[PDB]
Amino acid sequence: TTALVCDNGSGLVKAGFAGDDAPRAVFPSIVGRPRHQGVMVGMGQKDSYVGDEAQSKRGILTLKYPIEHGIITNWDDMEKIWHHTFYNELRVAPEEHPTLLTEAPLNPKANREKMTQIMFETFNVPAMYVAIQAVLSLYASGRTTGIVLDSGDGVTHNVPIYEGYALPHAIMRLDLAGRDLTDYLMKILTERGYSFVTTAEREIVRDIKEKLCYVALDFENEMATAASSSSLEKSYELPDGQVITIGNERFRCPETLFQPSFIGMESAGIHETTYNSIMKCDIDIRKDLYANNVLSGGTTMYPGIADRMQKEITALAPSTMKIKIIAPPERKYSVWIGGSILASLSTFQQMWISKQEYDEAGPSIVHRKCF
Amino acid sequence: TTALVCDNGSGLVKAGFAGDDAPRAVFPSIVGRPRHQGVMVGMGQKDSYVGDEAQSKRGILTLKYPIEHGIITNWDDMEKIWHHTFYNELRVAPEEHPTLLTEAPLNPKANREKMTQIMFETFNVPAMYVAIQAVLSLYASGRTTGIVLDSGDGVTHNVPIYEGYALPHAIMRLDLAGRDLTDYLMKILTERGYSFVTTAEREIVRDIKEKLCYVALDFENEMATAASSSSLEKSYELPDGQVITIGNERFRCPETLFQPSFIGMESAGIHETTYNSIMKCDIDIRKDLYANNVLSGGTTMYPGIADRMQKEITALAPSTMKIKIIAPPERKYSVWIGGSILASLSTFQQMWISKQEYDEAGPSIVHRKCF
Amino acid sequence: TTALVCDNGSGLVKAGFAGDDAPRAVFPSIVGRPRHQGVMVGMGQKDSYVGDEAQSKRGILTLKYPIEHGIITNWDDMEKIWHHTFYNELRVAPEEHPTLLTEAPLNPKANREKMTQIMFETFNVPAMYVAIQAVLSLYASGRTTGIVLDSGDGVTHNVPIYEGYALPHAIMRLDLAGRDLTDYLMKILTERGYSFVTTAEREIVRDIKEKLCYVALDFENEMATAASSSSLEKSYELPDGQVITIGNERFRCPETLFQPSFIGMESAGIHETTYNSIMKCDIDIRKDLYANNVLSGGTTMYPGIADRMQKEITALAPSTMKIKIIAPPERKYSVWIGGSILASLSTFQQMWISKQEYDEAGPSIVHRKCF
Amino acid sequence: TTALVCDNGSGLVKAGFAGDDAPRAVFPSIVGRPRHQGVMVGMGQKDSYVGDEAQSKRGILTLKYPIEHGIITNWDDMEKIWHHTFYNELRVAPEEHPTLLTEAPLNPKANREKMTQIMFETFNVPAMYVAIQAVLSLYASGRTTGIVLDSGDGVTHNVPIYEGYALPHAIMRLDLAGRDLTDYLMKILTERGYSFVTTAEREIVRDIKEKLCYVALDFENEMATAASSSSLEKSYELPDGQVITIGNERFRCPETLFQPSFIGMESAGIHETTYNSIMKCDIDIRKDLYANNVLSGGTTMYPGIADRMQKEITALAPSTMKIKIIAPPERKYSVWIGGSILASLSTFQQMWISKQEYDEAGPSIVHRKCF
Amino acid sequence: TTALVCDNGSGLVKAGFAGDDAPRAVFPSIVGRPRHQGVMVGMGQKDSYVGDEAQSKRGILTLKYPIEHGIITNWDDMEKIWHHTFYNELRVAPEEHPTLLTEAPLNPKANREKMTQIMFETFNVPAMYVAIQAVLSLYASGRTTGIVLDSGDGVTHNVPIYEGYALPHAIMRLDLAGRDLTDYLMKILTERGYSFVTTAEREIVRDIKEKLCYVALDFENEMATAASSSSLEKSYELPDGQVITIGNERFRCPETLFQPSFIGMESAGIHETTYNSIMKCDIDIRKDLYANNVLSGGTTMYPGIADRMQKEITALAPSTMKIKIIAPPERKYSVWIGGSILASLSTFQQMWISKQEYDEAGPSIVHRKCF
Ligand SMILES: Nc1ncnc2c1ncn2[C@@H]1O[C@H](COP(=O)(O)OP(=O)(O)O)[C@@H](O)[C@H]1O
Ligand SMILES: Nc1ncnc2c1ncn2[C@@H]1O[C@H](COP(=O)(O)OP(=O)(O)O)[C@@H](O)[C@H]1O
């Protein structure tokens, strides 16, 4: 039999089969409901659209995300998401397939327990397993040591691993990610008159971000370059027409990752939490960690982010070590790729949580050595 | 057939064949176990690393020494050490080779008896013999008289020998050695801010000691020189970067050998236990003993220790005798070299403890005239 | 003339006059700076708030600690702390008051040297003296022998003293303390759903710890009791309503003192380091040390710490001994009380360091006989 | 006026008044000095503890014996011992008391000369006298003939006396005694696992010896009995718990008196030096000497020593003699008892050395007919 | 054919060929045996060293003399001594050489009988003969009349001879000699603190005596001058150092020959036994005997002994007689010189005891006319 690999993430569902090179179903993790009245009798319209259909009916729906920061907040919505994923995108019967789920470090425990309970009671899968996103990223990267920085859409986290041993006291988790970058871009785009307030203009702003934003290698020099020239100013065409022109806020948006004070957060940038995780690890694995700094997740896809991260970590660490940043082109799907590798490993077929184990030990069996 | 020569020591295993000029397997006498959880499934990692592999995986393991001061405290660990030595470093079958083991004077008797029992029951050797480290050092030195000072890593001892007769009432044993010097250096390095607490930072401190420490010919003058100048201050580069600078504690560390009150011990320095052993011997061999003062073992490898020892013993002994200190460059391996010489001697092939003798007389046969 | 006793500690400054029964001024050693912009013109607000004031404006400020683990890292805001202590809490001119300050064992030398340089040049005190915290704790406890465990907020140490003589080779120092317990509690509350990330929320977590945590007498039985019953849950009220309930976390937090592997340290618990510091001492005084085990400092204030530690040390020591744990109710002020006693002795008035003494011998005079 | 009988011994001072039945003050002849630094200010530590106090503060002192083998090696320490004896134990003023002091045969002459110089100048006694220990033993035994074997703590000696005349050419002195037995017991316990190294553990070993050792009647049969049975082993309770169990070490320690080759001496046992002194004596008195063999001193106090020595001397002497060994229960104090008897004798009152005689003839007066 | 002349004596074997001016082999008559353990395998050490070889290894051996006072008390040792003398010092086959041996007057008969039995059965000489030592002294002196005083190392004797006739009733023998002088010097050296107890230190004391001792002309005046001045003090350097200073015991040692009460003997001095032998002779052969008083042997080698003995004998004898004392410089070897002369005499060749005479008459042939 084959196992499914559902990388829920927070803002993009990625599912597929264990043993493939890529997911076969990538769609947004949104659930939309109509907000207007509806006049044409016989239209027979539905009450809630899931996934990629909601993005077509944006102008009529209110789009809600069922996952805020890794954490699931709307369990009925999330159950709809899973039902859509199993039956409409993949077209499989979940009572014949083990399912490997992913989760971020340092989430509540009820999240994981309720996820297991759903997967066994509602969808009736034979086995299931919840994996950490950073470990799976390291599987897909081909390493066995290295400090991984998995910046998704809800959370950002560093997880240092050495020789296959993870150092839990050095795990860092930050709640700044692509969703906060989108909100900051919505906010600073009002300096030029453009206003995006609806829950469906957030998708337009996310598209603008993905297509035009980039990380500056030096922030003050790019500030001055934008103040003087106009060579970095680019245009974008809305779904309506009426092109908008983006100036220096092409690189002020992702700079929030290195200066979280822009959105009023207290914490330090990703370049500094990475270094603090290093310095919290031992002394005789720090050289390997410096040399194996692995990036994954969608928020690491900006142009120039690897070069910026290297410049910063190099200015932080001692001057005698080679600091190297691994940033594959298929970063966004690294967690899923690693999940497929892991679930196909023949050694892993004894780590599943079978259904009988659950029936006899309750949902608490998730936090056991299968953690 | 050939005999093996395993100089267990306390902190460095040295093994080889009888009839060679040097040991072919020198590795630390440590056994490491992982202390973190281990996340990558399929890693298939082991549960305990022995020898030189543990020093590579330092940052992940807890390193334990199975020999405290000559005495073996963890018999399972020591059995792992021996298994590694026989099968992985030397690649020999111990049921075809006699084995010569070494031990320090004035150890418990159960140490030696249990060692014999292990070597005959577990490893199944045909013969075995336990030798004293100082006697073997004197074999390797080419002498037949002389007072030998064998400062290893667990124990220090003087053993005066004259014309091949050892004087047991004049044997001295002190429990100050390289391990205590390492602990004292860890402690006094905190005066400059460097902190080494982990069981794997002790190895870094041992490296610092070996590479930078030296014995002062005069302690107050070097104290004043370090207080005034900076010409004796040297630097070292950790596995992490961040060089550390060592000042006057380059020579305060090995000065504990001549002033054991530094670590709160009651006893007297090595220069004074040597002289007390002399003065406890007869009156008409003291001139030869003064002239044949032999050093061996790793803790005698400091720069200037021979000159310091000579200055001290010369100030102690009467003014009309030539005091001479023999300190070969291959000091650290003298016990092993002498062991190889002894086991190759054709006269010695009748001093082995055969397996039938053991089977008929129990492990008590070790303390007989083969003592 | 009277002397000032300033037990600057690490996390609480306790000051007062020598000869009083308790410290007069007790406030957190915190320097806060505003992180937002400030709009109301005429507010005339200041740049940095110190001490107890900074906890009122805690929501606007970003709080720094000038002392990390006993050691002083930031010196400018430490001068700010001292200035606030002298002029705003005590209202005394330090030009006519000798000052007694405390420090933990096994600290850098530059700490003391800069401390006295500042106290003589910036504040112009006529005399000063730096004392060890454990000795003052023994003074206040009224013993003259006994092994004292002084768990503050940055550092934990054992100092065995017999008959008025301290045995420095048996002094242990551990960098696990109240701030590490606060960080572990922050990290462990996350699994229940609550997130505290800001330096202003670290103070709320410290309050939760102080008011709800306790040491379990039997850790496994308490874990089972929490996994079965619910009679352990207590509720706390955040500054904005939002009641939170904690179970396991009540005793899993201070258990880090007895199992430092919870926060990834390699060392042994406070009970085991106390026992090891006893076993480092001479065999004749271990009776009195076992019978006079003195606790002091804030981190020793959990309910059940004394009973737990007595149980542990009793199971470690031989069966013939009487183990006693001395834990006064005015425990967390013992260092200050002893400091006042000491500075109040007529025998002490010739052990200060004078102004001219310093002016002639430089700051190096701190380590010499005027200790 | 009454005289003072101070039998200073070597390892035990015994003092009192002439005319008593027993010494009033009995304490070890020990001077201790603190070896640690001392932190409690104001308690006013002193610099040297002498006597029974040094055994209470034993854990933090270095204990020195001012007298090595009968001979005094530290005159300042000995003056402290005598001052303590006169003022803090007997509470008498030596300006008004004659003092009888005791010495072993065949010591240096400067010993007696400096002893009397001190007693007349430092302490200003009105008279003094130096007696031989064996003669006083024979007084206290109620004999006037007999060969006395006085085994103290530094020196053993035989002094054959017949009819009140001593045979000086037959006096034998041996430098093996209780101190060498203690050192041998330390060195021989080390082979069972226990190690006592400090001068403060020498006292614990001496206590073990006194309390558990005995003399075997047949050494080979007791060795075989210990090798086969286990009925010989006793346990002892160290001053911190951790009982130790000793087997054949109980009778192997005092066997050094009969086989001084155990500690590398060449001489003959006490049973053989006794017989050799007898055979040096004239042929007409050997029968009386065989019949009056008197034991005294602390080292003659082992269980079974009288029976052993009778067996040995009987096997040595001709088979027609009555060998008889006189061993009173108050052996240890025989020298003091005899000294009291002698100083109370009325004939003795013109054999003191007066202050006038000393001021007249210098310290040389000690070796004159006023011996 | 040539005869061997072996003069054994008690403490110096000296042998050679008949017809030489001196012995070619002079060495001590000691047999040493190792008393320590022996650790170096392959050292191949022996079990007993004899002669001068045993003097180089004193620090390891226990030295025995096989001849106590003229009398041989260890026949195995004596056989070893003779074997060494024949084969290693002289290198001759004793089966082809007659052998002349010596002994003192008034020894047991079995000594002489067993001597010849050994020399015929074991060493298998063709002939042998035993001669009185004093007669051979008189041969070497070039006289045929005189009273000869032969002080060896175990025995002293006078033998008056007149015109070649020996007067057996006037022969005196005294058991005071160099060995007793060495023992007395060891005993009185302890007055200054030097102690020599080992059989190997007896040899150091013998060398001291030989090099420093002398006979005083007036004992009381020399004692007075030693008490007053310090011009008699002479220093000696032991095999190590601690040069010893010898005062009046330079001449108190050999004064035991003139006052044997010093070592507790009843007899009279050598001067008085010489005079008594004279007055024991005939009243017609006393003038020649007074005029031919011949000294020989090693104990007559002190500076001043001839003058002292002349003063004493002159004070004893009548005033009209001229006393003369013949003291050649080669006194120590006079017995050997005379033995060589006698054995080379052609008249003597009929006086040997042939092997056939022995075979037919038993060892009784030695006291017979074959003397
Ligand atoms: N090329 C890009 N540049 C910048 N941001 C991107 C890019 N592609 C995707 N993103 C951001 O990544 C986020 C999705 O990351 P993803 O890896 O899907 O995490 P998750 O699966 O947890 O949602 C989106 O919010 C989007 O804004
Ligand atoms: N060059 C050096 N200088 C100072 N110490 C050294 C040096 N080389 C080795 N050592 C010390 O010697 C010890 C090892 O001594 P060794 O002869 O191996 O004894 P053993 O074999 O009993 O461990 C180590 O603890 C190390 O600290």
Ligand SMILES: Nc1ncnc2c1ncn2[C@@H]1O[C@H](COP(=O)(O)OP(=O)(O)O)[C@@H](O)[C@H]1O
């Ligand atoms: N009742 C309590 N229970 C547990 N911990 C406490 C309690 N009161 C204070 N503490 C802890 O003690 C620490 C302060 O200890 P303190 O004696 O002030 O050391 P310092 O003076 O070095 O700051 C604080 O971090 C706090 O968390």
Ligand SMILES: Nc1ncnc2c1ncn2[C@@H]1O[C@H](COP(=O)(O)OP(=O)(O)O)[C@@H](O)[C@H]1O
């Ligand atoms: N019961 C005993 N058994 C064996 N040895 C003893 C006993 N009592 C005392 N001793 C030994 O006797 C010694 C003291 O002898 P002592 O008569 O005091 O001589 P001195 O007075 O010269 O010191 C001590 O070293 C002690 O070890």
Ligand SMILES: Nc1ncnc2c1ncn2[C@@H]1O[C@H](COP(=O)(O)OP(=O)(O)O)[C@@H](O)[C@H]1O
């Ligand atoms: N120069 C000397 N002065 C004093 N005594 C001497 C001297 N030379 C030898 N002796 C003593 O003479 C003894 C040896 O005498 P020796 O003639 O050998 O007699 P024997 O041959 O019977 O042993 C030795 O004990 C030594 O002490």
